[PDB]
């Protein structure tokens, strides 16, 4: 049934759980405080409006909640604001009593990285993937040491169609 907390996520039965040394440990459901962050840029100063972004926010938010995460949603941020939000996320006390995290970034993007709300060709406003990793590593986020950190990025990485032709 989809009426439960896991919604439309298919359940792992107890028989399947015992069937599955090389697995990340899961914290007790009763006491764990899983955290997730979604940053989505829909409204921009110079680049077109990302119509349909609300559908992505809804889907990802509900999915991560279904998987047991408390989801923070931040919208329409500059690269600098994204950095500030990431640093704040990395400092959250809940990570200490968490076993993992998800980070979701959804925006316009170029080869270099993810576009902030104020991005243009003259004045670039870019957040690099390298910066995301650095802010979440053991040095800057010790609370997530040994814990899975899943980073999801919806964005272009350039202008190319990503295809080549071939004849059969």
């Amino acid at each position: 049934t989809s009426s439960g907390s896991e919604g439309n996520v298919k359940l792992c039965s107890l028989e399947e759980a015992q069937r599955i040394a090389e697995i990340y440990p899961i914290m007790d459901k009763s006491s764990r405080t899983r955290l997730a962050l979604i940053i989505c840029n829909e409204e921009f100063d110079s680049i077109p409006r990302r119509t349909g972004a609300e559908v992505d926010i809804t889907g990802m938010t509900m999915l991560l909640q279904n998987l047991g995460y408390s989801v923070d949603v931040k919208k329409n941020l500059t690269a600098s604001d994204m950095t500030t939000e990431l640093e704040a996320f990395a400092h959250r006390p809940e990570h200490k009593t968490s076993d993992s995290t998800f980070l979701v970034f959804m925006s316009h993007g170029i080869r270099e990285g993810i576009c902030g709300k104020k991005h243009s060709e003259q004045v670039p406003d870019i957040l690099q993937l390298n910066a995301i990793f650095n802010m979440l590593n053991t040095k800057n986020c010790p609370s997530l040491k040994d814990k899975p950190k899943v980073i999801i990025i919806q964005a272009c990485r350039g202008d190319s169609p990503g295809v080549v032709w071939f004849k059969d």
Binding site: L11, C12, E16, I20, E22, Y24, R50, T138
Partner: protein
């Protein structure tokens, strides 16, 4: 006493397309990668680890149409299998 730990470990990134290349977003239906990822997570989180799930997402994009893209996993330092164990 103090101990050493790897500065970067237990990361996995999943991007909507490959370097240089576009990712597609339907104006009413949303981003195809995001939609595809949700569908695969809903279906396979119970039985597969995240690396296996992301691989299945990549397979689902294999046959290119007019709006093609190939999702990619990057900077993977997962040392174990990450099972979500939904329901637990």
């Amino acid at each position: 006493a103090i101990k050493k730990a790897h500065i970067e470990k237990d990361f996995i990134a999943f991007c909507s397309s490959t370097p240089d290349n576009v990712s597609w977003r339907h104006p009413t239906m949303g981003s195809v990668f995001i939609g595809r990822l949700i569908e695969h997570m809903q279906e396979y989180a119970c039985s597969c680890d995240v690396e296996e799930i992301f691989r299945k997402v990549r397979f689902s994009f294999e046959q290119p149409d007019g709006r093609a893209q190939m999702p990619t996993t990057d900077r993977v330092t997962l040392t174990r299998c990450f099972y979500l164990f939904p329901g637990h």
